[PDB]
Amino acid sequence: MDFNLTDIQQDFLKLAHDFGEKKLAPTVTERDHKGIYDKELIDELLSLGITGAYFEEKYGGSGDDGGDVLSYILAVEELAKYDAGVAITLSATVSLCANPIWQFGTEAQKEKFLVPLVEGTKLGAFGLTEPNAGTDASGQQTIATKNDDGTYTLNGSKIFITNGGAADIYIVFAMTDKSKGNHGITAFILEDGTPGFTYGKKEDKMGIHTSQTMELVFQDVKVPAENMLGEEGKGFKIAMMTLDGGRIGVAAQALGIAEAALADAVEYSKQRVQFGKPLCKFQSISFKLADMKMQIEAARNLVYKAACKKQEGKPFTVDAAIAKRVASDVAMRVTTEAVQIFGGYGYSEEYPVARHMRDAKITQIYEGTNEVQLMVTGGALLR
Amino acid sequence: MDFNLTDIQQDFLKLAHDFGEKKLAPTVTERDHKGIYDKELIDELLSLGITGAYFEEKYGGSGDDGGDVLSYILAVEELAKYDAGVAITLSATVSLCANPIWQFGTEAQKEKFLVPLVEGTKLGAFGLTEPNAGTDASGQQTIATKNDDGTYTLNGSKIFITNGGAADIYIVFAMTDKSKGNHGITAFILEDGTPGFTYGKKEDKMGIHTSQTMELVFQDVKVPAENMLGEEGKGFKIAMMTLDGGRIGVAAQALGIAEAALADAVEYSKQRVQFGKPLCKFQSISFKLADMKMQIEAARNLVYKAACKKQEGKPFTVDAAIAKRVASDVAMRVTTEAVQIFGGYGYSEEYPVARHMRDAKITQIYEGTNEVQLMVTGGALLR
Amino acid sequence: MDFNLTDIQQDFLKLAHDFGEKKLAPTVTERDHKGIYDKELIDELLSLGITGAYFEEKYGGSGDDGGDVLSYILAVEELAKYDAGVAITLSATVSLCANPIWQFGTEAQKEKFLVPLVEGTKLGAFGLTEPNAGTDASGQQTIATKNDDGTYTLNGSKIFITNGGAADIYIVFAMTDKSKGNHGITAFILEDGTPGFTYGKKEDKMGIHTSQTMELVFQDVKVPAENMLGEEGKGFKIAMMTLDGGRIGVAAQALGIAEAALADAVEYSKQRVQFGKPLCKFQSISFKLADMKMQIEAARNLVYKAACKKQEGKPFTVDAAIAKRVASDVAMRVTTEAVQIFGGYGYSEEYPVARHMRDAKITQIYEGTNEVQLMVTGGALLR
Amino acid sequence: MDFNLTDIQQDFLKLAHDFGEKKLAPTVTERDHKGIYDKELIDELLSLGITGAYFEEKYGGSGDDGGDVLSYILAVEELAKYDAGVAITLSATVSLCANPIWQFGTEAQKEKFLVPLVEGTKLGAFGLTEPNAGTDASGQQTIATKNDDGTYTLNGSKIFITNGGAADIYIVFAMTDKSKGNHGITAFILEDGTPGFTYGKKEDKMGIHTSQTMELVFQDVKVPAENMLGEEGKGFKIAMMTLDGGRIGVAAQALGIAEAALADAVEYSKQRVQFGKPLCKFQSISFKLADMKMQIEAARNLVYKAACKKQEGKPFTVDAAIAKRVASDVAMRVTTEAVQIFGGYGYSEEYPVARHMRDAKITQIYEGTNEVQLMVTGGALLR
């Protein structure tokens, strides 16, 4: 047992911190107010090296130099303190797009699609959810028929796709057989700009305004057999396994939003003077701050636990589920308390505290709701 | 003991309901998105009669005809289901402006200022809070000096004033002596358009976008002795007592927002089909709905309790405190759960569920935070 | 609407308060530690007329003179403050025995059986639960075979019977026809001492030590045709409707336990000093006390509302369900908190606060676990 | 970072598990019901070498061979699953007695006093609390007067001493100088049987029945100069630093209780059936179980993190504080829930689930109430 970070992990931590401080911190309030997805920040982010933390140097990563999942995770958490929208933009690329190519991809697919993503040359997306396939990821309407070419044709739509529009490489799931549903989904790689491949209306979301969420529409889109990721009919397995990893990302995002709120409330409590005393002098305030701190620490070691488990090659399915949920709930509790400590000022979008509360809410929903997290843990528990 | 509504109460209930259905419901999403304060809706609202529910016919009200506090409250709750921003606009006028004139005003002040407000001819506001006087309503910088005329001069600012800008009659509190602070605040009536009396920047708030919140600035504003509401140095008493009543309004607002969320989640649970079943078929969903319903009912009888106590002439200080807090907390719990039940769709500002959550948050803050509500109840408890 | 107790309601309340003060309070710690059921005290309680509060004078009750369900509920609450176990022995009789004979019995069965329960010359009990039928009421295995004599022969047993072994008149449900389970259960008035009617295991329980809980055994118990309550097959309906009323009583007991715990905590926080200040002057303490008070107030008005609807003849199944779950959930919370305020002393069985915690847990389980109340409420909600 | 137990850690864990399985489990219900402290079992436990896990071979411990604080913590957790009262008698010795002699004692005092505590030939206890000094440690009234012989005379008493009346070696704190309270407390090694050293009230407690809690009485107790631990005036520092470690143990015990309650609930939900389905197939049940599991995981990693920092020599006061409050708060929750899943049977002292609830409450109060942990953490947060 050990809870000390390696120097390498600290490098990736400090890395995102400096960026978050000099680039993200100043413009976040503007960008969130206007809902601006700043492609230039993303490009700067992507060139930092964080994207290839745990990937082998073979593909242009720091994996062979001591980088690991926890490094990448630590960065996600750090970025989420400054800008949650950007934090999830990064997390989606690595955990949900690069990873599955890296895991289930052939060397050709890796050399072609993985290395750009690892090197920060391209951005990735994950297109699984659609109107009738939410938590039930098998009510998928999207069809993927085979042609005499040996190529496939996709027809469908995807709803709520993070990084949609802005992304270059999309991992898309389609039903190659709608009889064995759960055993008949196939994963495909789509490049931005494929004929027939279009985008729909942009999502009008409650918070996380710096992240771009958009619909995708597939209209007779023909892709080569080469773009098929993994075996035909093994798509559900691929989605679930990559979602296990992503859950650690969302957990880490939730954690960062929470630490953001605590930091804000702590420094505010010392400056706001009412009844002649700074807020921190009133026992209730102090105790709210201490309790928030306890929850944040509780979530923390669970998030890190999962990242370590993953990098070790140990099954982390339940651990991720646990980290995602405890982290998301903490985020929501801690964030709602933070606004309260700021009084009326917390209700103003001039202050950072309101934003955090709005952001906390998606972490209980996307990448599998907290209820599925209950499903994954209980299923394990009852075996 | 009796928990049946009078027909008169049901009249005022049905009244706001029809309005909320035909006028508020259609445009709320637009107005909230754009932050539009629609003066025309307010004018329609004000002519409904709700404003004079518990005021004697003497002043143009329904008080002598069987109208009472609970009637006015029931309407507030009802409007809050459709539009929380409009709900608080109404509540502020009656509870926080008309009432104190009605309670501490001379007949001249009533005939001049009360009857318009009661009849729906004018809108009122309550200007107590300022930068250094939040929960500590005695760090008031606003000065009110006496002149050789016998008239007074006001210099100051007020922050976060609901109905600010839009209102006609403002109840403003100023320090006539800054030595006996808590015993040296005086209440004054200000008419919109008084020279020196200006407004500052409009509040950029997290939710409740349909309510207009603005700063007021007093620059050498001279008012006649006639505009002094109550005795000099008795302002704190007047603010507290009127805040006791308003707390029932905010409680009723919180209740309505909660019922709004429950209604949404209930009908959604029946339409959203996942895994082949509507959401309401999964035990967890049903139980979330049932629990939400229990909290809403718990808050409810507490809100009504306070309104009845007030109309009876019984001291309702603690009851209001209890209603305000339990209602606000329920609103926040129930509202956050509602978004969860809607999945990703709840995170979209296209759906009503996100709005409700954003609104719930002010009810724990304005008109005295939930912590002061703890202060008022515990103070009583330890006597 | 009206939240005022009547003269009569206050009389029954005062009545129970003096019995609690004089007869219950001085011995409760002894009786609880030793787990004794004092038949003399119960016979004393029964002689006060509380048992007849809402039944008509023609059965020996105060119903014809202004006594109502609430008066009886106020009594149960009051007794619960002193001795939770005694409160329930009483609640069981009136709500689970006298009520179904009154509500379903023929005038004959009323003259014979109801009169003594109302007058207090006999105690009653409700036998429904079996080892294979707790929450699943339909799992009845006790059979009620019909004989040539138009007689019945009961064979089976009942588990966890409050007042079991100490009651005179029992209401037992048995399967007359096991084809139509939930439509084939029959209720019978079974008298203690009937040949074949034996008692078994006396339950050793965590709390509520002053209440006797016993197993009933039916070995070839012959019952006359005029002991059938209702009619063949409507025994489930009878039990269900009986349980709605019984639940209002349990909600009341739960309320009473919470009130006792709050009062102990307030009184103690005034006296105990640390750091040179009485406990009540530390803000976390006074806030704790305040929250407790708010919760019990939330539960209170739900308890009373349910009692009034029953006495008014309105449908109250759901109000009973909300009351029981909120009141007990509040009890469990306030209870666990009062022990905390007492510190090391709250963990000592010398002080009363641990007993209140032990007692509080049962209010969540018996007369329908809180989860059943959620089932009841949510089902009504989805109708 | 690393969350892997070592071979040695697993050895001490297995060790405690077999003692629990063989010696503790079969008699626990009897011993708990009768409130007996079995000296033979304790002497058995002490002979396993657990007591010496992290102390060096020169005192008879396994510290020089890979035993560490965590190994001892794993033991405490494990024992707590079977007998919470036994777990704490052990925790008290190692953490509250052997540790301060080791950490503050001279080599002489170590050879004499530490050796037997490490070897397990004597039991130890920690006497700090007084009726006028619980949370306010500074309220010490026991005086330690100096004599011509360079000797000390202790006069006073101590309340609530775990292992009191059964311990050989005691650590008592007494005011050497009452001017500088918090800077004038002194620690002394006091041996059982020293003339003047008597015992008093044996506490009758709600739970943890297998633990002996007794009052210590000091009437003219002469102590030799070389029994002073530390030096005049630094007894508060000693006690504080002793309590940080002790708290990691209490967090562990609390963890163990929670784990026992979860396991009972899982095992039961698999077997018990209602409505024709095993309890674990109703979604509210499996979700409950899942949440419980998540909470205990949250607490687990906080408990272990604190243990590692202590063994690593990092500062751990706050980690101890977070661990103790989370673990106990989780215990109280999981505990109250497992009783619910058992239904009517969970309320019976035949089953183990009620004991776990009774035991869980003390983990929130002793070795520093959770409110103190909040004080500790929040203060460090506002530095």
Ligand SMILES: CC(=O)CC(=O)SCCNC(=O)CCNC(=O)[C@H](O)C(C)(C)COP(=O)(O)OP(=O)(O)OC[C@H]1O[C@@H](n2cnc3c(N)ncnc32)[C@H](O)[C@@H]1OP(=O)(O)O
């Ligand atoms: C950037 C972003 O923001 C990303 C987005 O949010 S991504 C969109 C998020 N959407 C979701 O998370 C959907 C949530 N739903 C799910 O994860 C799943 O549908 C579910 C957990 C509900 C389970 O569904 P289910 O149909 O009951 O399947 P389940 O019983 O779990 O497993 C079915 C099969 O898949 C296999 N499987 C499940 N999980 C697996 C895993 N992690 N790895 C491999 N195989 C797995 C099972 O072993 C089983 O295989 P066999 O039938 O061959 O034995």
Ligand SMILES: CC(=O)CC(=O)SCCNC(=O)CCNC(=O)[C@H](O)C(C)(C)COP(=O)(O)OP(=O)(O)OC[C@H]1O[C@@H](n2cnc3c(N)ncnc32)[C@H](O)[C@@H]1OP(=O)(O)O
């Ligand atoms: C539409 C909207 O959105 C409206 C807005 O939100 S309105 C702005 C909301 N702002 C607030 O609610 C401020 C909250 N703060 C307060 O209410 C108070 O300052 C407080 C509760 C914190 C108490 O402050 P305090 O200085 O400690 O005074 P407190 O001890 O309560 O009472 C002081 C005096 O006032 C009197 N007083 C207090 N409450 C009173 C009441 N309800 N009626 C009459 N007198 C009262 C006390 O009896 C005492 O009088 P004496 O000294 O003459 O005996």
Ligand SMILES: CC(=O)CC(=O)SCCNC(=O)CCNC(=O)[C@H](O)C(C)(C)COP(=O)(O)OP(=O)(O)OC[C@H]1O[C@@H](n2cnc3c(N)ncnc32)[C@H](O)[C@@H]1OP(=O)(O)O
């Ligand atoms: C002293 C003490 O401590 C007291 C004791 O605890 S005794 C109590 C111990 N046992 C319990 O509390 C039992 C808990 N279980 C229940 O309440 C029920 O089993 C339940 C609520 C879970 C529902 O079970 P179910 O089998 O699904 O019944 P359900 O289908 O809802 O209803 C069956 C029929 O009875 C009727 N019914 C149900 N509840 C009713 C009510 N409150 N009033 C009237 N009729 C009712 C239904 O309308 C239905 O009629 P039809 O069959 O003609 O349509």
Ligand SMILES: CC(=O)CC(=O)SCCNC(=O)CCNC(=O)[C@H](O)C(C)(C)COP(=O)(O)OP(=O)(O)OC[C@H]1O[C@@H](n2cnc3c(N)ncnc32)[C@H](O)[C@@H]1OP(=O)(O)O
């Ligand atoms: C078997 C069992 O069941 C065990 C039992 O329960 S025994 C435990 C029963 N009693 C307790 O748990 C006591 C609870 N109370 C406390 O812990 C403390 O009183 C407290 C945390 C509330 C603080 O009290 P306080 O009087 O405010 O002390 P505080 O001012 O913080 O500290 C006093 C000094 O000691 C030092 N100190 C405090 N905590 C310290 C720590 N953890 N490590 C080192 N030094 C510490 C401070 O730095 C300070 O030094 P200076 O005076 O030189 O500046």
Ligand SMILES: Cc1cc2nc3c(=O)[nH]c(=O)nc-3n(C[C@H](O)[C@H](O)[C@H](O)COP(=O)(O)OP(=O)(O)OC[C@H]3O[C@@H](n4cnc5c(N)ncnc54)[C@H](O)[C@@H]3O)c2cc1C
């Ligand atoms: C900002 C945002 C970004 C997203 N980004 C992506 C992305 O990049 N890629 C992608 O593919 N998807 C993405 N999504 C979609 C997201 O993952 C889904 O919204 C989420 O998985 C929930 O699906 P749903 O909205 O259909 O909820 P539903 O499945 O309709 O569920 C609704 C509610 O019912 C609950 N529920 C459902 N089934 C059960 C059951 N059997 N038992 C109990 N409770 C149940 C759910 O937990 C939820 O509370 C995103 C969504 C948002 C809002």
Ligand SMILES: Cc1cc2nc3c(=O)[nH]c(=O)nc-3n(C[C@H](O)[C@H](O)[C@H](O)COP(=O)(O)OP(=O)(O)OC[C@H]3O[C@@H](n4cnc5c(N)ncnc54)[C@H](O)[C@@H]3O)c2cc1C
């Ligand atoms: C949308 C909106 C509308 C409003 N409308 C009006 C209006 O119409 N009229 C009006 O006059 N005002 C109005 N206000 C102001 C509002 O009532 C105040 O914001 C509120 O009373 C809190 O004051 P504050 O913001 O200064 O918080 P602060 O007083 O700074 O308090 C900040 C935090 O510390 C807590 N706190 C403060 N003192 C203590 C203490 N002693 N012990 C423990 N906790 C403490 C508070 O509860 C809060 O959590 C409005 C505010 C908003 C956001």
Ligand SMILES: Cc1cc2nc3c(=O)[nH]c(=O)nc-3n(C[C@H](O)[C@H](O)[C@H](O)COP(=O)(O)OP(=O)(O)OC[C@H]3O[C@@H](n4cnc5c(N)ncnc54)[C@H](O)[C@@H]3O)c2cc1C
């Ligand atoms: C002291 C005491 C006195 C009692 N007195 C009486 C009395 O006088 N008369 C009488 O007839 N009975 C009496 N009972 C019985 C009592 O009402 C039952 O214990 C209760 O109905 C629960 O049934 P059970 O114990 O079989 O638990 P179960 O029915 O097994 O329930 C166990 C757990 O599973 C949950 N559960 C069960 N079914 C579901 C489902 N479908 N979905 C979700 N969760 C579910 C329950 O809520 C609970 O958490 C008494 C019990 C006690 C302890």
Ligand SMILES: Cc1cc2nc3c(=O)[nH]c(=O)nc-3n(C[C@H](O)[C@H](O)[C@H](O)COP(=O)(O)OP(=O)(O)OC[C@H]3O[C@@H](n4cnc5c(N)ncnc54)[C@H](O)[C@@H]3O)c2cc1C
């Ligand atoms: C079974 C048992 C075993 C024990 N074993 C030992 C042992 O071996 N050795 C030993 O020395 N002691 C022991 N104790 C004592 C124990 O640690 C004390 O009970 C504990 O420190 C609390 O002190 P108190 O009981 O005086 O309660 P109090 O100090 O009166 O505290 C009472 C309540 O007020 C709260 N409170 C107190 N001060 C404040 C404040 N400033 N702000 C906010 N809230 C506050 C507390 O958190 C608690 O809720 C034991 C106790 C028990 C019950």
